[PDB]
């Protein structure tokens, strides 16, 4: 029975990949609690500020950005800035149901 | 608390958005005991904590892991829930308040837009994926095959093959046909079968982006010749190897 | 302006060492260089610009590793043995053998040995030329041999030069007239 | 550079009548 | 193996 | 910073120089170079002689530009760091290979643009830098470069080979084998 | 029928989308019967762009069930010829 | 001060999120959304310090003036009205004139190198295809190109994507008939 | 009785050929997941799929092929694209039984 | 990535007085 300590093993390292993809998400999480603590403990007063304060600032805002999302903080941070009802007419002109399901008898409209 | 927050807050609103402004600059105003100021502060951490924690982990996630669009489901409610909660007591905001919660669920409409779409183009190149490889093992069993290639129906199959893959939807785009043939030719001319799958599959057609032409003039003219020319060195060299197993047996 | 400059030159060097690759054989002196109008005029550290950026791109393409090797032999055929390509990989070579000789001090060989990587893969691609190229690093070339090729332990080599570090002067005298006698004795 | 000359002289032509009756077979 | 391989040819470095 | 210029303002510490530069660039152990240092320089003067000798002896068997070349005050640097690893090591050739690893990184070795005109001439580094910033040391190469082809070119009877660059003390000259054509170019 | 028996199985509890699955249903039928109205050469030119998203299209997912079941009988049927000889 | 801290983190993660993207800094609805955003800053409480405020934007004009898009959006804001101290200026005030001269030339060379970097990436695609061991793999990956640059821009023709994709497929039918020559041969 | 654990250790021997014999079934096993381990981690979408993607994507189609059934699988496939009573009559073309045994009364006609 | 790094200037000594 040498196949069930092998086949454990391999098991056991699947799901030792599966942590793998586990520890970016809690390193992502450990990277903004770390930014937190930069923004609590650096000293904001007076915005005279030295490199090493503007550096550890410019980081954790970085690290307090989203970067999967960005382009959709920008837009939305645009929509607010410049200006259920909302929400249904920016879905009709995204051609999206309300299940979030693609809505193909307004895309396909050209075509019937 | 809040309402002696809410008294100071309608003293203060007295007083016109300069001399506010001017106020703040000055000691003579705190920071948290302006309301609009206030407001505006919870407003955006509620909606940086919707984004950016919740949504770019979820989206990390999704591009690798969501199996379905339910477990999607489940695990954004909770990362909602609990991110909203550790964003705001990280910051000074306490996760019980309107302004917060607004901004919470400020975009939360073109977020789900973005977030789904996402998931559904995720599956889609999952099943595009699998129609690829699938396809690839089909024309991989047929083609590498001397004897296979050697039938007088190989080559129709083949172009039978690619016609029903590019009508029911398989081998998903033309680009992705493109290089299923060639790849196919490529391996014909290599397995000892491809001079006579060849001449056999050259003057079949094959109904590209472009227009509707024979596999010949998809392929180069001289990619052809290359192609007839290595497949008839693969026909002789795979003759030469048998026949010297022979003679040294 | 200058990025604009050696944007344009570095494309005309390019033409030039294809033409010597192709066999047109054709000078590499930045003086003889077309200039356009557009390009400058060629400064002689844009030589050098362009073999490490030439390096870099065949690095960075996606043919494989083994057709890497070929072209950065091919570059470093087409020089005129002041060619950039020829003190880029000879930079290569002498920090290769700064690797082998820190190895040697340490008495263990670090890790991940970046230059001697580099080396041993342009070197697979063709010994004999490497070596010609580069004589003296012939002791360095035979480690590698040694290490690859063969089986010998790098650590064995490794502490054998560590002990073997004792030149004497007249060992060396000694070392000369017994070679020379090898040599007139081998038949 | 006369050996790699010559070498290239006779591949040439003989890769142009190869080429030809292989053509020529196909 | 019925897959025959390709002959190796001398190659010429070429750019668009 | 800049190590060509601190190395010629202190001459004296060439060798402790050497010993960072060898800990911080090279790979080499502290410990090592510690050890070494504390185990056997013991030999003492009346093997020095023979030391002197034998650092003019392989000056002279060298064969390489610049080591037969070599500049004026690289000249006291390159016999510091020389004695230093033959002292620490014992391995004539790691002292050569220092010495000729230091005489590369402070020179440039300007070399006949020929089938061989090849080494014109072995300036120091800091002779051609213009400006404070060390890597600048290129501006000034390009500047004696287009000096070395303008004199060729103005005057026909001088060919490549006829040349030669060589520094005295805060000079750069650049002349014929003949006297009747001399450039200096000073800092 | 086998949608109910599925929900029960896979999760003891706390599934509220049972309603919403067969909501989901409809609207993949709904979905599927849209691009069915769309002829083969339309179909294939939403395939080639981001449009028809190739989950939806009922003929190249049938095909890609179909393909894949074959090919999984293959293999198991590989396993046991390789086990016969 | 952990009030304001908080307000300057929301400010710059939601400024430098718009305004470090090209794409979204190439729309005119970034030069009005900045405009319009200091505005409320100042106007709501946010931003607290008119000093933070003036931080805050130098800093996003800094990072405008390193990406791509970024000098067009300075083209737009730079006539943009501005109220920090009493006076009310435009951007082009509020930053110093030269100040503003050296962002403009920033951002146009941070625009040329983003392009040329571009087309490197292209041309080194096109590149990697055309160095290929087996010309039938060019042509394959020709045709990805091919595909991707269909995806992109069918309409327009004779872009220099273009003419650089069809001088690699007629490179590439040369090396089908090369190839074709050497298969005989080896035949 | 040292006849007895040197007996036990030729059985465990035997024990160890099958066993062998196993793990050959279990590394094709994980040599599949591993593929599709490819197919999952690979984009073979933009049709730029660089020379490690092509060669993965290859590779991790060469292990779900089946070398076996190989022909069966052709075969098949070149039936289905070109076109009970379909699958008796290919047992009849076969000159097999019902129960899948050689149908010797067909195969010897002329006899 | 996005950004380009801007290219150095040579580095001077100043005094406010």
Same mark, same amino acid.
């Given at each position: 029975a040498?196949?069930i300590?092998?086949?454990?093993?391999?098991?056991?390292?699947?799901?030792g990949?599966?942590?793998?993809?586990?520890?970016?998400?809690?390193?992502?999480?450990?990277?903004?609690?770390?930014?937190?603590?930069?923004?609590?403990?650096?000293?904001?007063?007076?915005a005279?500020?030295?490199?090493?304060?503007?550096?550890?600032?410019?980081?954790?805002?970085?690290?307090?950005?989203?970067?999967?999302?960005?382009?959709?903080?920008?837009?939305?941070?645009?929509?607010?800035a410049?200006?259920?009802?909302?929400?249904?007419?920016?879905?009709?002109?995204?051609?999206?149901?309300?299940?979030?399901?693609?809505?193909?008898?307004?895309?396909?409209?050209?075509?019937? | 608390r809040?309402?002696?927050?809410?008294?100071?807050?309608?003293?203060?609103?007295k007083?016109?958005?300069?001399?506010?402004?001017?106020?703040?600059?000055?000691?003579?105003?705190?920071?948290?005991?302006?309301?609009?100021?206030?407001?505006?502060?919870?407003?955006?951490?509620?909606?940086?904590?919707?984004?950016?924690?919740?949504?770019?982990?979820?989206?990390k996630?999704?591009?690798?892991?969501?199996?379905?669009?339910?477990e999607?489901?489940?695990?954004?409610?909770?990362?909602?829930?609990?991110?909203?909660?550790?964003?705001?007591?990280?910051?000074?905001?306490?996760?019980?308040?309107?302004?917060?919660?607004?901004?919470?669920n400020?975009?939360?409409?073109?977020?789900?837009?973005?977030?789904?779409?996402?998931?559904?183009?995720?599956?889609?190149?999952?099943?595009?994926?699998?129609?690829?490889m699938?396809?690839?093992?089909?024309?991989?069993?047929?083609?590498?095959?001397?004897?296979?290639?050697?039938?007088?129906?190989?080559?129709?199959?083949?172009?039978?093959?690619?016609?029903?893959?590019?009508?029911?939807?398989?081998?998903?785009?033309?680009?992705?046909?493109?290089?299923?043939?060639?790849?196919?030719?490529?391996?014909?001319?290599?397995?000892?079968?491809?001079?006579?799958?060849?001449?056999?599959?050259?003057?079949?057609?094959?109904?590209?982006?472009?227009?509707?032409?024979?596999?010949?003039?998809?392929?180069?003219?001289?990619?052809?010749?290359?192609?007839?020319?290595?497949?008839?060195?693969?026909?002789?060299?795979?003759?030469?190897?048998?026949?010297?197993?022979?003679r040294?047996? | 302006?200058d990025?604009?400059?050696?944007?344009?030159?570095?494309?005309?060097?390019?033409?030039?060492?294809?033409?010597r690759?192709?066999?047109?054989?054709?000078?590499?002196?930045?003086?003889?260089?077309p200039?356009?109008?557009?390009?400058?005029?060629?400064?002689?550290?844009?030589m050098?610009?362009?073999?490490?950026?030439?390096?870099?791109?065949?690095?960075?393409?996606?043919?494989?590793?083994?057709?890497?090797?070929?072209?950065?032999?091919?570059?470093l055929?087409?020089?005129?043995?002041?060619?950039?390509?020829?003190?880029?990989?000879?930079?290569?070579?002498?920090?290769?053998?700064?690797?082998?000789?820190?190895?040697?001090?340490?008495?263990?060989?670090?890790?991940?040995?970046?230059?001697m990587?580099?080396?041993?893969?342009?070197?697979?691609?063709?010994?004999?030329?490497?070596?010609?190229?580069?004589?003296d690093?012939?002791?360095?070339?035979?480690?590698?041999?040694?290490?690859?090729?063969?089986?010998?332990?790098?650590?064995?080599?490794?502490?054998?030069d560590?002990?073997?570090?004792?030149?004497?002067?007249?060992?060396?005298?000694?070392?000369?007239?017994?070679?020379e006698?090898?040599?007139?004795?081998?038949? | 550079?006369?050996?790699?000359?010559?070498?290239?002289?006779?591949?040439?032509?003989?890769?142009?009548?190869?080429?030809?009756?292989?053509?020529?077979?196909? | 193996?019925?897959?025959?391989?390709?002959?190796?040819?001398?190659?010429?470095?070429?750019?668009? | 910073?800049?190590?060509?210029?601190?190395?010629?303002?202190?001459?004296?510490?060439?060798?402790?120089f050497?010993?960072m530069?060898?800990?911080?660039?090279?790979?080499?152990d502290?410990?090592?170079?510690?050890?070494?240092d504390?185990?056997?320089?013991?030999?003492?003067?009346?093997?020095?002689?023979?030391?002197?000798?034998?650092?003019?002896?392989?000056?002279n068997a060298?064969?390489?530009?610049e080591?037969?070349?070599?500049?004026?005050?690289?000249? =006291?640097? $390159? @016999? /510091?760091?020389?004695?230093?690893?033959?002292?620490?090591?014992? #391995?004539?050739?790691?002292? %050569?290979?220092?010495?000729?690893?230091?005489?590369?990184?402070?020179?440039?070795?300007?070399?006949?643009?020929?089938?061989?005109?090849?080494?014109?001439?072995?300036?120091?580094?800091?002779?051609?830098?213009?400006?404070?910033?060390?890597?600048?040391?290129?501006?000034?190469?390009?500047?004696? =470069?287009? $000096? @070395? /082809?303008?004199?060729?070119?103005?005057?026909?009877?001088?060919? #490549?080979?006829?040349?030669? %660059?060589?520094?005295?003390?805060?000079?750069?000259?650049?002349?014929?084998?003949?006297?009747?054509?001399?450039?200096?170019?000073?800092? | 029928?086998?949608?109910t028996?599925?929900?029960?199985?896979?999760?003891?509890?706390?599934?509220?989308?049972?309603?919403?699955?067969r909501?989901?249903?409809?609207?993949?039928?709904?979905?599927?019967?849209?691009?069915?109205?769309?002829?083969?050469?339309?179909?294939?030119?939403?395939?080639?762009?981001?449009?028809?998203?190739?989950?939806?299209?009922?003929?190249?997912?049938?095909?890609?069930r179909?393909?894949?079941g074959?090919?999984?009988?293959y293999?198991?049927?590989?396993?046991?010829?390789?086990?016969?000889? | 001060?952990?009030?304001?801290?908080?307000?300057?983190?929301?400010?710059?993660?939601?400024?430098?999120?718009?305004?470090?993207?090209?794409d979204?800094?190439?729309?005119?609805?970034?030069?009005?959304?900045?405009?319009?955003?200091?505005?409320?800053?100042?106007?709501?409480?946010?931003?607290?310090?008119?000093?933070?405020?003036?931080?805050?934007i130098?800093?996003?004009?800094?990072?405008?003036?390193?990406?791509?898009g970024?000098?067009?959006?300075?083209?737009?804001?730079?006539?943009?009205?501005?109220?920090?101290?009493?006076?009310?200026?435009?951007?082009?005030?509020?930053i110093?004139?030269?100040q503003?001269?050296?962002?403009?030339?920033?951002?146009?060379?941070?625009?040329?190198?983003?392009?040329?970097?571009?087309?490197?990436?292209?041309?080194?695609?096109?590149?990697?295809?055309?160095?290929?061991?087996?010309?039938?793999?060019?042509?394959?990956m020709?045709?990805?190109?091919?595909?991707?640059?269909?995806?992109?821009?069918?309409?327009?023709?004779?872009?220099?994507?273009?003419?650089?994709?069809?001088?690699?497929?007629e490179?590439?039918?040369?090396?089908?008939?090369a190839?074709?020559?050497?298969?005989a041969?080896?035949?």
């Amino acid at each position: 029975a040498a196949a069930i300590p092998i086949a454990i093993s391999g098991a056991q390292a699947i799901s030792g990949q599966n942590a793998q993809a586990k520890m970016i998400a809690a390193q992502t999480a450990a990277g903004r609690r770390q930014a937190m603590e930069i923004m609590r403990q650096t000293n904001i007063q007076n915005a005279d500020l030295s490199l090493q304060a503007r550096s550890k600032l410019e980081e954790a805002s970085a690290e307090l950005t989203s970067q999967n999302m960005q382009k959709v903080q920008a837009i939305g941070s645009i929509r607010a800035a410049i200006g259920v009802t909302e929400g249904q007419f920016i879905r009709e002109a995204n051609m999206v149901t309300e299940n979030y399901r693609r809505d193909y008898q307004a895309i396909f409209a050209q075509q019937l | 608390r809040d309402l002696a927050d809410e008294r100071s807050n309608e003293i203060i609103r007295k007083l016109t958005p300069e001399q506010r402004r001017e106020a703040l600059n000055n000691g003579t105003l705190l920071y948290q005991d302006d309301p609009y100021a206030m407001e505006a502060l919870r407003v955006k951490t509620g909606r940086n904590a919707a984004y950016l924690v919740d949504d770019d982990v979820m989206q990390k996630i999704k591009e690798g892991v969501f199996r379905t669009r339910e477990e999607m489901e489940e695990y954004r409610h909770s990362r909602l829930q609990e991110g909203a909660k550790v964003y705001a007591e990280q910051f000074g905001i306490d996760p019980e308040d309107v302004d917060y919660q607004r901004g919470f669920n400020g975009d939360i409409t073109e977020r789900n837009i973005s977030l789904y779409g996402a998931h559904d183009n995720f599956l889609s190149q999952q099943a595009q994926k699998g129609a690829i490889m699938n396809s690839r093992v089909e024309l991989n069993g047929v083609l590498q095959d001397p004897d296979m290639l050697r039938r007088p129906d190989s080559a129709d199959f083949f172009e039978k093959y690619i016609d029903n893959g590019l009508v029911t939807g398989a081998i998903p785009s033309d680009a992705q046909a493109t290089q299923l043939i060639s790849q196919a030719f490529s391996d014909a001319s290599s397995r000892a079968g491809g001079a006579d799958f060849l001449m056999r599959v050259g003057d079949k057609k094959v109904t590209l982006n472009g227009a509707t032409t024979t596999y010949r003039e998809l392929i180069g003219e001289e990619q052809w010749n290359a192609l007839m020319v290595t497949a008839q060195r693969s026909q002789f060299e795979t003759d030469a190897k048998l026949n010297e197993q022979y003679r040294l047996k | 302006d200058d990025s604009m400059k050696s944007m344009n030159k570095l494309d005309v060097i390019d033409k030039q060492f294809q033409k010597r690759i192709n066999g047109e054989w054709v000078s590499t002196d930045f003086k003889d260089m077309p200039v356009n109008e557009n390009t400058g005029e060629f400064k002689h550290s844009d030589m050098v610009n362009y073999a490490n950026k030439k390096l870099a791109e065949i690095d960075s393409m996606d043919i494989p590793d083994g057709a890497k090797d070929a072209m950065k032999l091919k570059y470093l055929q087409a020089d005129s043995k002041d060619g950039a390509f020829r003190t880029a990989i000879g930079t290569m070579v002498t920090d290769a053998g700064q690797e082998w000789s820190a190895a040697v001090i340490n008495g263990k060989l670090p890790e991940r040995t970046p230059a001697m990587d580099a080396l041993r893969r342009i070197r697979n691609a063709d010994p004999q030329l490497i070596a010609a190229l580069y004589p003296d690093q012939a002791e360095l070339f035979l480690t590698m041999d040694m290490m690859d090729k063969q089986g010998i332990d790098p650590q064995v080599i490794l502490d054998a030069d560590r002990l073997t570090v004792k030149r004497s002067k007249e060992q060396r005298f000694e070392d000369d007239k017994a070679f020379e006698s090898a040599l007139n004795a081998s038949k | 550079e006369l050996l790699s000359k010559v070498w290239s002289e006779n591949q040439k032509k003989l890769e142009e009548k190869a080429r030809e009756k292989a053509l020529a077979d196909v | 193996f019925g897959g025959s391989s390709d002959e190796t040819d001398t190659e010429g470095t070429e750019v668009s | 910073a800049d190590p060509q210029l601190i190395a010629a303002l202190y001459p004296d510490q060439a060798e402790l120089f050497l010993t960072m530069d060898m800990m911080d660039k090279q790979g080499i152990d502290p410990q090592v170079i510690l050890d070494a240092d504390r185990l056997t320089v013991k030999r003492s003067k009346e093997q020095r002689f023979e030391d002197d000798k034998a650092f003019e002896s392989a000056l002279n068997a060298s064969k390489a530009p610049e080591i037969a070349r070599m500049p004026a005050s690289l000249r =006291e640097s $390159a @016999r /510091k760091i020389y004695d230093s690893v033959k002292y620490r090591s014992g #391995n004539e050739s790691m002292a %050569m290979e220092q010495m000729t690893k230091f005489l590369k990184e402070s020179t440039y070795t300007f070399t006949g643009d020929d089938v061989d005109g090849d080494t014109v001439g072995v300036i120091p580094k800091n002779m051609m830098q213009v400006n404070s910033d060390p890597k600048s040391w290129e501006q000034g190469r390009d500047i004696l =470069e287009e $000096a @070395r /082809k303008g004199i060729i070119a103005s005057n026909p009877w001088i060919t #490549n080979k006829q040349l030669t %660059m060589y520094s005295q003390g805060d000079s750069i000259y650049l002349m014929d084998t003949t006297g009747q054509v001399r450039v200096r170019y000073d800092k | 029928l086998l949608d109910t028996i599925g929900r029960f199985a896979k999760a003891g509890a706390d599934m509220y989308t049972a309603k919403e699955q067969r909501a989901r249903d409809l609207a993949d039928e709904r979905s599927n019967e849209i691009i069915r109205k769309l002829t083969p050469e339309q179909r294939r030119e939403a395939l080639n762009n981001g449009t028809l998203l190739y989950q939806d299209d009922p003929y190249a997912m049938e095909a890609l069930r179909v393909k894949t079941g074959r090919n999984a009988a293959y293999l198991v049927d590989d396993d046991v010829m390789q086990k016969i000889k | 001060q952990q009030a304001q801290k908080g307000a300057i983190m929301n400010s710059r993660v939601e400024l430098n999120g718009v305004l470090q993207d090209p794409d979204m800094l190439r729309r005119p609805d970034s030069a009005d959304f900045f405009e319009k955003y200091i505005d409320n800053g100042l106007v709501t409480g946010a931003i607290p310090s008119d000093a933070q405020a003036t931080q805050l934007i130098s800093q996003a004009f800094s990072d405008a003036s390193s990406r791509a898009g970024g000098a067009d959006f300075l083209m737009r804001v730079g006539d943009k009205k501005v109220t920090l101290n009493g006076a009310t200026t435009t951007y082009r005030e509020l930053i110093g004139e030269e100040q503003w001269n050296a962002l403009m030339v920033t951002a146009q060379r941070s625009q040329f190198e983003t392009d040329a970097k571009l087309n490197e990436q292209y041309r080194l695609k096109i590149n990697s295809a055309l160095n290929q061991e087996d010309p039938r793999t060019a042509w394959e990956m020709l045709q990805g190109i091919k595909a991707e640059l269909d995806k992109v821009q069918p309409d327009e023709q004779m872009t220099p994507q273009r003419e650089w994709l069809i001088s690699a497929q007629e490179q590439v039918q040369n090396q089908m008939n090369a190839w074709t020559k050497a298969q005989a041969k080896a035949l």
